[PDB]
Amino acid sequence: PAVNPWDVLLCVSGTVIAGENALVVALIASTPALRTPMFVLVGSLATADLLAGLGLILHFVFQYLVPSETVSLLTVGFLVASFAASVSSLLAITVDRYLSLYNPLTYYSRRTLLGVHLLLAATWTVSLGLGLLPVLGWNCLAERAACSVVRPLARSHVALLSAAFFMVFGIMLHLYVRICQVVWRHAADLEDNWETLNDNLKVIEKADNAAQVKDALTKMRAAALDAQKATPPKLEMKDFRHGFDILVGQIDDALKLANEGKVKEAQAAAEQLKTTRNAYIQKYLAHLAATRKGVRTLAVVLGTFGACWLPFAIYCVVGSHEDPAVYTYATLLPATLNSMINPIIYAFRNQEIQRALWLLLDGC
Ligand SMILES: CC(C)CCC[C@@H](C)[C@H]1CC[C@H]2[C@@H]3CC=C4C[C@@H](O)CC[C@]4(C)[C@H]3CC[C@]12C
Ligand SMILES: CCCCCCCC/C=C\CCCCCCCC(=O)OC[C@H](O)CO
Ligand SMILES: CCCCCCCC/C=C\CCCCCCCC(=O)OC[C@H](O)CO
Ligand SMILES: CCCCCCCC/C=C\CCCCCCCC(=O)OC[C@H](O)CO
Ligand SMILES: CCCCCCCC/C=C\CCCCCCCC(=O)OC[C@H](O)CO
Ligand SMILES: CCCCCCCC/C=C\CCCCCCCC(=O)O
Ligand SMILES: CCCCCCCC/C=C\CCCCCCCC(=O)O
Ligand SMILES: CCCCCCCC/C=C\CCCCCCCC(=O)O
Ligand SMILES: CCCCCCCC/C=C\CCCCCCCC(=O)O
Ligand SMILES: CCCCCCCC/C=C\CCCCCCCC(=O)O
Ligand SMILES: CCCCCCCC/C=C\CCCCCCCC(=O)O
Ligand SMILES: CCCCCCCC/C=C\CCCCCCCC(=O)O
Ligand SMILES: CCCCCCCC/C=C\CCCCCCCC(=O)O
């Protein structure tokens, strides 16, 4: 028993990672529709995870099948660059999601596409550099007292890697809270205006004087428009939104009658407003149910990223080369599992990626 079980587990993990992310890469590459900034970023993440998966397999190969210290230095440097590129790609994705939420219009501009190009060129340039430094000689091959828990990386180089991870993670947390903030605000405004919409509709049905009817119709018009704004836009869906378009229209019809002195007729028009409102009551509950689920996903995915990488990042600066290798393996394996989760969260859950997959399975 000279093969270490953990090395086999990493090879298995790398195989799953490579297979998952190779499929994502193939789907985006062969689908001209998937060329927006968002998908350029997903393709970068998938490529990095693909490279990291292959790297785990290669590390096994040149440890056990072609024993080579030199090529093992290359494989570890390869993995440093691949995981750096994956973590930095997650940062870039998060930046993009922030910008699309905070700039519902100016996000769709030439600057945004330029920004992804420059950001990815920079993250990949830095990622490669980080893996190239040990290959060029910033390693512990000469001085074994300077070895980190991941051979043959030098403790000082690994400290830099962990510092970069902590900074990247801190930025993601900042963006996460801002994203969370915007999603909560819009959901709160939608639920507010929807409730006031219903309140005034009851005022109409129970009105006893004409002043109440006009007042309630005036508030319904404002609430309808505010509820529309809080709904995310179609693109660059708008069916739930267009439900408010015909509500404003009906409210304007009732207001016209009320202003001409036909308040009885304006009140009776609430039956039609209640009919309209009831038709979109499910789309409203479904939208609130989707945002709720999305918020949960946000936190779960970021928490899982932290649970997978933080123990490793911490142990890499606290541990030393004297520790048994199992503690490096036990903290490294979860970090690799995150590269199995990434394609599911950022690629396979996307409807356009699923469509490309359907066209691929069905022979186009
Ligand atoms: C040690 C490893 C990391 C070296 C990797 C070298 C090559 C293969 C890397 C470096 C930069 C990478 C590119 C950077 C960004 C993108 C955009 C993405 O939408 C598709 C993949 C693509 C086009 C990558 C393809 C692979 C790539 C060219
Ligand atoms: C020996 C171990 C097994 C190695 C062998 C399995 C490797 C699977 C990896 C990636 C497959 C997903 C990427 C390929 C997806 C198809 C590429 C494509 O676009 O094909 C279009 C064509 O119409 C259809 O063949
Ligand atoms: C991250 C930056 C570093 C990335 C580095 C990627 C380098 C890959 C390039 C070429 C393949 C080289 C393959 C070398 C195959 C060597 C086969 C061999 O003979 O090596 C066994 C040797 O004899 C034992 O004694
Ligand atoms: C060895 C090197 C290690 C480096 C370790 C540190 C990593 C973090 C550095 C840069 C990421 C910057 C990402 C962009 C930050 C957010 C930009 C943003 O939100 O602003 C966009 C602006 O508002 C548009 O108008
Ligand atoms: C989302 C999933 C997140 C998963 C996060 C996992 C974090 C694992 C961290 C520590 C486990 C350490 C396990 C160490 C097992 C040691 C067994 C033992 O006794 O070691 C023998 C050794 O020779 C005597 O030093
Ligand atoms: C989806 C792919 C299937 C994954 C199955 C899991 C792969 C398990 C591979 C290696 C695990 C090694 C188990 C360790 C055996 C005991 C080792 C020992 O006692 O020395
Ligand atoms: C044996 C060395 C291990 C490295 C293997 C390298 C093979 C994978 C390299 C790149 C795959 C990424 C291809 C990206 C295609 C995207 C095209 C597009 O976005 O339009
Ligand atoms: C593009 C698919 C992924 C390819 C990289 C991962 C799989 C491993 C591929 C090749 C491993 C063998 C490399 C060549 C070994 C030569 C040994 C020798 O010449 O003595
Ligand atoms: C993408 C950039 C990659 C290179 C970044 C570094 C640039 C500076 C040039 C050379 C320094 C790299 C080598 C440092 C370790 C030397 C160890 C030694 O000589 O024994
Ligand atoms: C802002 C981009 C900067 C690009 C240039 C960066 C150049 C980096 C060069 C060297 C980094 C430090 C390398 C340390 C080598 C130590 C060698 C050893 O310990 O034996
Ligand atoms: C995130 C900051 C922590 C430092 C990151 C280090 C990145 C190294 C990545 C892959 C190298 C994996 C090599 C295989 C583990 C062997 C462990 C051992 O030395 O016994
Ligand atoms: C998740 C919270 C993010 C907070 C980021 C704080 C800034 C992090 C920057 C540097 C800290 C890492 C320095 C590690 C040095 C260890 C050296 C050693 O003992 O080998
Ligand atoms: C048994 C399949 C495991 C599936 C993934 C979960 C990983 C944790 C379970 C087992 C780890 C591999 C076996 C540990 C070998 C102990 C000997 C050693 O430390 O080198």
Curated annotation (Swiss-Prot):
GO biological process annotation, one example: G protein-coupled receptor signaling pathway
Main location: membrane
Molecular function GO labels: G protein-coupled receptor activity; sphingosine-1-phosphate receptor activity
Cytoplasmic side: 26-37, 96-116
Lipidated positions per record (S-palmitoyl cysteine): D362
Residues passing through the membrane, by range: 6-25, 38-61, 74-95, 117-136, 162-180, 295-321, 327-348
Subcellular location: Cell membrane
Cellular component terms (Gene Ontology): cytoplasm; plasma membrane
Topological domain ranges for the Extracellular compartment: 62-73, 137-161, 322-326
Topology versus the membrane: Multi-pass membrane protein
Keyword field contains Phosphoprotein: yes
Record keyword Phosphoprotein present: yes
Keywords: Cell membrane, G-protein coupled receptor, Glycoprotein, Lipoprotein, Membrane, Palmitate, Phosphoprotein, Receptor, Transducer, Transmembrane, Transmembrane helix
Function per UniProt: Orphan receptor with constitutive G(s) signaling activity that activate cyclic AMP. Promotes neurite outgrowth and blocks myelin inhibition in neurons.
Family membership noted in the UniProt record: Belongs to the G-protein coupled receptor 1 family.
Name under which the protein is recorded: G-protein coupled receptor 6
GN (gene name): GPR6
